[PDB]
C-alpha cells in the first residue's frame, strides 16, 4: 500500500512508482527509471537528516511514502487519503484506533496534470507543496496556485535563454517547430510571447507536428518543403523529442540540402550520441541548451548496499528486485547482491532535486520551530496549532547549499532560477568529436563568440536580417509589413533623408548634393563676355571708342577759322557731349556689378539718351523757321527737356523702393543637378520699354519734319545726309519689338537682351557718326 | 451529527442550521429562519417523492441531511465527508463495517463563500451541485465552475431589469449607492458593465458606504451633500440594506430637501412597511424590484403536524423545540403541540426553491435511469458505473412545473431565468397606502406608464437628459466629454448644419437662410432709373432728344436756297448722322439687358464716337488749306478712319471669346444677410479707357492746328465758335481719368460709372451742336 514511518511530524510523498497500462487496471507494470530510485533517495535523505544533529536535534521527522501510478484520479484519491487523517471527525460504527497522523507538507507530484490536480486539491486546505519534476509553465501563477513550489526551472527560462542567444548572435528570421503534448506547444508559445514583449524579433514559420501515425514519412517532407521556401530563414528552433529530430535530420540528408540552415536545440536534445547517426555534417553547429547535471556520491553508496533482508519498510523493493533480474520465486534468485554489478545502471538527474526539496522543507520546519518556541527542549505545543501561511512564507525565504554546488532559492513566483550551459557539436577541427562547452546562462548571457566555428568556417558567416543593409547614402522606413524587418525604397533625388528614416523635401531655390546630406546650390551663373556672345557687342563698343577719337580730333583746333563758323557753336557743343554720353552708357550696361551701383548706370541710358536727340530736335526746327519766313534761345529749349528726363527717374525712386535681390530659382524639374541663377537689379520689362518709348515720340516728329525739309535749295551734302538717317533707324526699332515678345518663355533670356541692346545702341549712333564724318573729310579736302 | 436515511441511492445536503459565534467554537446558537425549516421541507419533499409512484416507482431515493454552521472550512470538511465514503480504499488497522453510501449529487450551499468552496472541491470529483440561495454573480462562469447549478436568478438579471426600466422611462443621470459586503459592490459593478455594454447610459456618482461604525451620522450627510451637488441628477439607485435606506431617508427628511429626487429599489427593499416611517412624502415614486413569492400549502400542513415523538430522524428537532418556546428539560415543556399557534411564524420564500431543486434532481435521475436501462424492473447494474458529465447534461436539459406556477429551467450558463414584478409606493392619492403592481419583468420589459402617477403629476414629470434639446435652427455635436450627453454650440451664421451633427461650410457666392436649411442667395441687385441717381442722366438723354428735334427741323426745307449753299453739303451730311448716332448710344448704355446683346450696344459708343469727330477733323483741315495757299475728296478721308474704328472692334472679338457672365460674389463678411450682385458684360476698365483714348489722341493733333485759325478775318462768328468748344471737351476728358483711380475699392462702383459717363456724353454733344446751330438762328429772327 504505502510506506509508513513513525514520527511526531510527518510529510506526504507522491511518486510515480508504477505506470498506467490497459484501461481496466489503473497502473500495471513497474518502472525503474523513476519508481524506486526516488523512493530510496528520499529514504536516504530522511536517514541522514535524522542522523545529523544540526537540523532538528531533539525532534525527529517522519514521512509517508506513497505511489501515484501516473493517474489523475489516483492522485486525487491519494491526496484525499493524506488529508482525511486530519480532516475526519469520527465514525459512528463498531466492528465487534490508529495514530492521528498529522501531516505538515507534501513532496512529490512529478508530472504536470497530477501536479495541477494536487495543487488544486491542497490549495483549499492550505498545505504547502514542493515539486521536483514539474516543468510546465502553467504552474507559475501565484494567484492560481497559492501553496505550490518548484525546485526545477520551467521552460520560460529556457525560452528566455534561447531568445537572448538569438539576439546576441544576431538574427531576425526564426522558425518554430514543436511536437505533440503539452510541452512543445507551451514552449513555442512562451518563446513567441517573450519575442513579442522584448521586441526586435519575429516569427516567420509556425508548423505543427501531429502524432497520429509513425509510418507516414510525408508530413516531414511537407514541413521541410515549407521551411525550404525562403532561403533567408537560416535559423530554426526545435522543441520535439529525439525521434522527431532524428527523422528530420534523415529527411534533410536524403533531400540533398545545400543551404545547411542552423539548428537550435532544447532540453530534449541535450548531449547524447543517439540523436546523431551519419548526420554529423548537417547537424554540426546546433546550439543546444541542457540543464546542469550533478552526480552525488552518498546516494549511490546507499543504494548499492541495500538487500532484501536489510530493509523491510519498502513494499515495492521485492517486486523491483524480481523485475530487474527477471527472476521469480522459471528462474529463482536468492541473495545475488549484484544490483550495482550485473546492470550498468546510472542515477538520474532528479535525485538531487528531491534531495534539495527535502532539505528546503527540513530547513523551513527547523526555522519555524526555532522562531516559534525556544525555551522548550522537545516539541512545544504551539508548533502543532501554528500552521498554514507561515510555513509557506518561511519556505519562500530560504537560501542554502544542497548536494550540488549551486544553491537553491525561490523567487516571488516560487520557481527556482534557471541555470543552463550551452553546448555545440563540432567534428571538423576539434580533436574531440563530442560536444564542447561554449558558454553558460544563469542570470546574464555569457557566450564566447570566438570559441565556436561551425560549418568549418568563420563564426558570423550566416545572417538572417530579412534584407541587405541597403545603405547607399540614403534610406527610408516603410510602415508596410511587420516592424521586425524593413524594406528600403529609393525616394526622389531632389531632397535628402531626414533622421535616416524618411525622405522629406528640402527648401526650394537650390539643389541637393549627391550624398543626400545637404540641400544647397553652390554653383552660380555669371555673364562672361568671352564665353557668351557678348564679345561682339564688347568689340563693337571698342570699335566705337576708336571712331569717336576722330570726330573730336578735328574740333579743338578748328574753332576759330572762318569755315566752321557757318555751323552753330551751341549746336556743336550739344552733339559733342551727346556722342560721348552714349559711349559711356554702352560700357556701363555691358558690365554687370553685384554691388548696389546700378542706379548710376540706368541714368546713362535713361537721361543720356534724350540729350543725344536734343541737338537733333532743335536743329530741324532751326532750319525750318527760315523756310516759313538768338543762339542762346535754342540752348534753353533743349535744356528744358533734359530736366524732364532727369526728373522722370526721380519720381520713380519715390514710387517704389529700389530693392535689389540676387537670389533666383530655376524651378526646372528636367535637370535636378542644373541650377540656373540670374541676379539683376530692377528687372522690369515695362520699365525698359517705357524709357525707350519716350524717345520714340520725339524721333517720330523729327522724321516727318525732315521729310518735308527735303527739296530746299540750301545744302546739298547736308540735306542728303540727314535724309538717309531718318529712314534707317526706324527699321531697327520696328524689329526690336517682335524679338522681345514670344521669346521670354525660357530662362536664358536674362543675358541675351543685353547683347542685342548693346549692338542696337551702337549702330544707331554710328549712322549719325558716319553722317558727321562726311563733312569732316570734305572740309579737309577743300 | 448528520441525519442518515437508508436507500440504494443517496444525495448529500448542506444547510446552515447553526450560526457562527465566538472565535473558539465554530458555530454556536441555532437559527430558525433557515435552520430547521429547510430540513423539514427537504424531508417532506423526499417523503412525497417516495410516496409518488410516477417518479422512481421501483427504486427509492435517500439522502444525508447535514449542517454547515456557516463556515467555509467546516463546509469543506462536510463536503469531503460525502466523497470520502467512495474515495477511501481501506484502513490497515483493527480495533479489537458500514454500507459504501454511494452518493450521486448534493443539494445545498445556501451562502456564497461556502458555495464557491463546495463547487471548487467537487469540480475535481465530477459531482453535480444545485444551489437555492446563491445569488452571487461570481458563480456564473461555466468554465470556472463546471458542475454547478442554481434555481435562483443572480443580481445580473436584476441590474438588467433596472437598466431596462431606466432606458424605457428615459433617464441620463443615475447615481449608484452600495453597502458593505460582496453584494452591493457586485451589483453596482454589473450595473455599470451592462450600462457600458448596451450604451446610452452613463454613471455620474459612485459613493461607497463603509461599516466601521453605526453611531457616526456624518458619512450619510457627506454622501447626501455629494449627491445634492448637481440638481439635474434626479435618479438614484440603491443596493444597500433596510437600515441604510432608512437612515438615508431620515437624513433627507431632516435636511429639508426640496428637489425630491426619485429612488430605485433593489431586492433588499422589496415590499415591507417596517422601513417606511414618517417618510411617505419623500419615498413616494420609488421603483422597487422584488422577486416573486409563492406560498405552498403542503409544507405548512406537514410542519404543523410534527411533534417530538412523531419523528426521530431529525437530531436538531429537540433543540429547536427547546429554543423556540424557551423551555429546558427553569421552565419545562411537555407536549405543547402549539408550534403553529403560539408563534405567528410564516414560511420563507426559499422553501419552493429547495423543493424545485429536489424535483429537478429527481427528474434528471429518473430520465437518466430510463435512458440507461429499460428492460430491468429494479436497479440495473449499469446505472452505478455510469455517472459524471451525463447527469450534469441531463440536469441542464430539464423543463417541468414545480410547486409554484412558473416553471423551472436552466440556460447555457446554468442559472434560472429572472422573473420579477415592479412595485411602487403611492399614498397621496391612492385608495390603499400600500404598494401596487405596475409591471412585470420575465423576458421582456412590460411596464404601464399611465398606471403610475403618485398624485399631482404626470408619469414623466422629472427630466434627466444632461442637456436641454436645442432646436432653434442650430445644432452641433462636440466630441469633448463623455458621449453620454451632448453639448451644442452656436457655429457661424454663414453656413447651415450638415446631418444635424456638424456645421459644414456651404458653397460660396450665395447667402444662407435663417432656419439653416439651405444656402442660396435668391435676392439680386438690378439697376433702376427711378431708385438710383440714374434718373438725371435719363432726363438729360430725354432733354437731348428735344434738342435734336430742332437742329434737323430746319434742314429738310433749307436745302436749295442760295443761303445754306455756303456750307458744304457733304460736311452737313456727316454732322447730321453723327448727332443722331450719339443720341442712340446714350440710350443703349442706359438700358441694361440680361441677354448677351450688348455687342450691338458697345459699337454705338465705340464706333459712333469716331463718326462724330470725323466731321470736325476734316473741317479744320479744309479751312486751313485756304490760309496756306473736290468736295468728294473730304468725304473719302473721313470714310477711311471709320473703317479703322469698325475693324478695331472686329479684331477684339477674335482675341477673346465674348462670354457673358452674370454671376457675382460680394465676399463681404460685415453683413452676412446682404448679398450684392452685379451683372455686366465685358466689364474692363482698360477696355473703356482705351476705346475713349482713341478720340483723345486725334483731338490733340487737331487743336494744335486750330491755333493759327484764330484771327482769320474770313468768318469771325464761325472762328470764335470752334475755339470755345475745344477747351470744354478737354476739360471733361481731363477729369475722367482721376475718377476710376482710387474709387473702385468699394463694391457699388458697377452702377455709378454708367451715370457719370451718360451725362458726360450729353454735355460734350450739347456744346458741339450749340456752336453749330448758332448761325442757323441768324436767318430766322433776322
UniProtKB/Swiss-Prot annotation, chains A, B:
Question: In which tissues has expression of this protein been reported?
Answer: Expressed in many areas of the brain, especially in the cerebral cortex, hippocampus, and cerebellum. Expression of GRM7 isoforms in non-neuronal tissues appears to be restricted to isoform 3 and isoform 4.
Grouped into one coarse class, the protein's main location is membrane
The GO cellular component terms are: asymmetric synapse; axon; cell cortex; dendrite; dendritic shaft; membrane; plasma membrane; postsynaptic membrane
Source domain of life: Eukaryota
Instruction: Point out the glycosylated residues in this chain.
Output: 58, 401, 429, 515
**Which BP terms does GO give this entry?**
adenylate cyclase-inhibiting G protein-coupled glutamate receptor signaling pathway; adenylate cyclase-inhibiting G protein-coupled receptor signaling pathway; axon development; chemical synaptic transmission; G protein-coupled glutamate receptor signaling pathway; glycosylation; negative regulation of glutamate secretion; regulation of synaptic transmission, glutamatergic
According to its UniProt record, where is this protein located?
Answer: Cell membrane
The cross-references to Pfam families, in alphabetical order and at most eight, read: 7tm_3, ANF_receptor, NCD3G
- The residues listed in the UniProt record as binding L-glutamate, with positions renumbered to this chain, are 112, 133-135, 183, 267, 350
Q: Which residues lie on this side of the membrane: Extracellular?
A: 1-533, 592-597, 656-685, 743-757
* Ranges annotated as spanning the membrane: 534-558, 571-591, 598-618, 635-655, 686-707, 721-742, 758-782
Classify the protein's membrane topology as the record does: Multi-pass membrane protein
What is a single molecular function from GO for this protein? group III metabotropic glutamate receptor activity
Q: Provide the effect of residue 601 to W.
A: In NEDSHBA; uncertain significance
Provide the disulphide bond pattern: 27-69, 202-484, 327-333, 373-380, 466-485, 470-488, 491-503, 506-519
Tell me which UniProt keywords the record has, alphabetically. Answer: Cardiomyopathy, Cell membrane, Disease variant, Disulfide bond, Epilepsy, G-protein coupled receptor, Glycoprotein, Intellectual disability, Membrane, Phosphoprotein, Receptor, Sensory transduction, Signal, Transducer, Transmembrane, Transmembrane helix
Q: List the InterPro entries hit by this protein, alphabetically.
A: ANF_lig-bd_rcpt, GPCR_3, GPCR_3_9-Cys_dom, GPCR_3_9-Cys_sf, GPCR_3_C, GPCR_3_CS, GPCR_3_mGluR7, GPCR_3_mtglu_rcpt
Record's comment on post-translational modification: N-glycosylated.
Question: Which parts of the chain does the record assign to the membrane side Cytoplasmic?
Answer: 559-570, 708-720
Pathological condition linked to this protein in its record: Neurodevelopmental disorder with seizures, hypotonia, and brain imaging abnormalities: An autosomal recessive neurodevelopmental disorder characterized by global developmental delay, hypotonia, severe to profound intellectual disability, early-onset epilepsy, and microcephaly. Neuroimaging shows cerebral atrophy, thin corpus callosum and hypomyelination in a majority of cases. Death in childhood may occur.
Its quaternary structure?
Homodimer. Interacts with PICK1.
What family does the database annotate?
Belongs to the G-protein coupled receptor 3 family.
The UniProt function text for this chain reads: G-protein coupled receptor activated by glutamate that regulates axon outgrowth through the MAPK-cAMP-PKA signaling pathway during neuronal development. Ligand binding causes a conformation change that triggers signaling via guanine nucleotide-binding proteins (G proteins) and modulates the activity of downstream effectors, such as adenylate cyclase that it inhibits.
Q: Please state what the protein is called.
A: Metabotropic glutamate receptor 7
Q: Which organism is it from?
A: Homo sapiens
Amino acid at each position: 500500500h504505502s510506506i509508513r514511518i513513525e514520527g511526531d511530524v510527518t510529510l506526504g510523498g507522491l511518486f510515480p512508482v508504477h505506470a498506467k497500462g490497459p484501461s481496466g487496471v489503473p497502473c500495471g507494470d513497474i518502472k525503474r527509471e523513476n519508481g524506486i530510485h526516488r523512493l530510496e533517495a528520499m529514504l536516504y535523505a530522511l536517514d541522514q537528516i535524522n542522523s545529523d544533529p544540526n537540523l532538528l536535534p531533539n525532534v525527529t521527522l517522519g514521512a509517508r511514502i506513497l505511489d501515484t501510478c501516473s493517474r489523475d484520479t489516483y492522485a486525487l484519491e491519494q491526496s484525499l487519503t493524506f488529508v482525511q487523517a486530519l480532516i475526519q471527525k469520527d465514525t459512528s460504527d463498531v466492528r465487534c484506533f490508529v495514530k492521528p497522523e498529522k501531516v505538515v507538507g507534501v513532496i512529490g507530484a512529478s508530472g504536470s496534470s497530477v501536479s495541477i490536480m494536487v495543487a488544486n486539491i491542497l490549495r483549499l486546505f492550505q498545505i504547502p507543496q514542493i515539486s521536483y519534476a514539474s516543468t510546465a509553465p502553467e504552474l507559475s501563477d501565484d494567484r492560481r496556485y497559492d501553496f505550490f513550489s518548484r525546485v526545477v526551472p520551467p521552460d520560460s527560462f529556457q525560452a528566455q535563454a534561447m531568445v537572448d542567444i538569438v539576439k546576441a548572435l544576431g538574427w531576425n528570421y526564426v522558425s518554430t517547430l514543436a511536437s505533440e503534448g503539452s510541452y512543445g506547444e507551451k514552449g513555442v508559445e512562451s518563446f513567441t510571447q517573450i519575442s513579442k514583449e522584448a521586441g526586435g524579433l519575429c516569427i516567420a514559420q509556425s508548423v505543427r507536428i501531429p502524432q497520429e501515425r509513425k509510418d507516414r514519412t510525408i508530413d516531414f517532407d511537407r514541413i521541410i518543403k515549407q521551411l525550404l521556401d525562403t532561403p533567408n530563414s537560416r535559423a530554426v528552433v526545435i522543441f520535439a523529442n529525439d525521434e522527431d529530430i532524428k527523422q528530420i535530420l534523415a529527411a534533410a540528408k536524403r533531400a540533398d540540402q545545400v543551404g545547411h540552415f542552423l539548428w537550435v536545440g532544447s532540453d530534449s536534445w541535450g548531449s547524447k550520441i543517439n540523436p546523431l547517426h551519419q548526420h554529423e555534417d548537417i547537424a554540426e553547429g546546433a546550439i543546444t541548451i541542457q540543464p546542469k547535471r550533478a552526480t552525488v556520491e552518498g546516494f549511490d553508496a546507499y543504494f548499492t548496499s541495500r538487500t532484501l533482508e536489510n530493509n523491510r519498510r519498502n513494499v515495492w523493493f521485492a517486486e523491483y528486485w524480481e523485475e530487474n533480474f527477471n527472476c521469480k520465486l522459471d528462474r529463482k534468485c536468492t541473495g545475488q547482491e549484484r544490483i550495482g554489478k550485473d546492470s550498468n545502471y546510472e542515477q538520474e538527474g532528479k535525485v538531487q532535486f528531491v534531495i534539495d526539496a527535502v532539505y528546503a522543507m527540513a530547513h523551513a520546519l527547523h526555522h519555524m520551530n526555532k522562531d516559534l518556541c525556544a525555551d522548550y527542549r522537545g516539541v512545544c505545543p504551539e508548533m502543532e496549532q501554528a500552521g498554514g501561511k507561515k510555513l509557506l512564507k518561511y519556505i519562500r525565504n530560504v537560501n542554502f547549499n544542497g548536494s550540488a554546488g549551486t544553491p537553491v532559492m525561490f523567487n516571488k513566483n516560487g520557481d527556482a532560477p534557471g541555470r543552463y550551459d550551452i553546448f555545440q557539436y563540432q567534428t571538423t577541427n576539434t580533436s574531440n568529436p563530442g560536444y564542447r562547452l561554449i558558454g553558460q546562462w544563469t542570470d546574464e548571457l555569457q557566450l564566447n563568440i570566438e570559441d565556436m566555428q561551425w560549418g568549418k568556417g568563420v563564426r558570423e558567416i550566416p545572417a538572417s536580417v530579412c534584407t541587405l543593409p541597403c545603405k547607399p547614402g540614403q534610406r527610408k522606413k516603410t510602415q508596410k509589413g511587420t516592424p521586425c524587418c524593413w524594406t528600403c525604397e529609393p525616394c526622389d533625388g531632389y531632397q535628402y533623408q531626414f533622421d535616416e528614416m524618411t525622405c522629406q523635401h528640402c527648401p526650394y531655390d537650390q539643389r541637393p548634393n549627391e550624398n543626400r546630406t545637404g540641400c544647397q546650390d553652390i554653383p552660380i551663373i555669371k555673364l562672361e563676355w568671352h564665353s557668351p556672345w557678348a564679345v561682339i557687342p564688347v568689340f563693337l563698343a571698342m570699335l566705337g571708342i576708336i571712331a569717336t577719337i576722330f570726330v573730336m580730333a578735328t574740333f579743338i583746333r578748328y574753332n576759330d577759322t572762318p569755315i566752321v563758323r557757318a555751323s552753330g557753336r551751341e549746336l556743336s557743343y550739344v552733339l559733342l557731349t551727346g556722342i560721348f554720353l552714349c559711349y559711356i552708357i554702352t560700357f556701363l550696361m555691358i558690365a554687370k556689378p553685384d554691388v548696389a551701383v546700378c542706379s548710376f548706370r540706368r541714368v546713362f541710358l535713361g537721361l543720356g539718351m534724350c540729350i543725344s536727340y536734343a541737338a537733333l530736335l532743335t536743329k530741324t526746327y532751326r532750319i525750318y523757321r527760315i523756310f516759313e519766313q538768338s543762339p542762346t534761345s535754342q540752348l534753353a529749349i533743349t535744356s528744358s527737356l533734359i530736366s524732364v528726363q532727369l526728373l522722370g527717374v526721380f519720381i520713380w525712386f519715390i514710387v517704389d523702393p529700389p530693392n535689389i535681390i540676387i537670389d533666383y530659382d530655376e524651378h526646372k524639374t528636367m535637370n535636378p543637378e542644373q541650377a540656373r541663377g540670374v541676379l539683376k537689379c530692377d528687372i522690369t520689362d515695362l520699365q525698359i520699354i517705357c524709357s525707350l518709348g519716350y524717345s520714340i515720340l520725339l524721333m517720330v516728329t523729327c522724321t516727318v519734319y525732315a521729310f518735308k525739309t527735303r527739296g530746299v535749295p540750301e545744302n546739298f551734302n547736308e540735306a542728303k545726309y540727314i535724309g538717309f538717317t531718318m529712314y534707317t533707324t526706324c527699321i531697327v526699332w520696328l524689329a526690336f519689338i517682335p524679338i522681345f515678345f514670344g521669346t521670354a518663355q525660357s530662362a536664358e533670356k536674362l543675358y541675351i537682351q543685353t547683347t542685342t541692346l548693346t549692338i542696337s545702341m551702337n549702330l544707331s549712333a554710328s549712322v549719325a557718326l558716319g553722317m558727321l564724318y562726311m563733312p569732316k573729310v570734305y572740309i579737309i579736302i577743300f
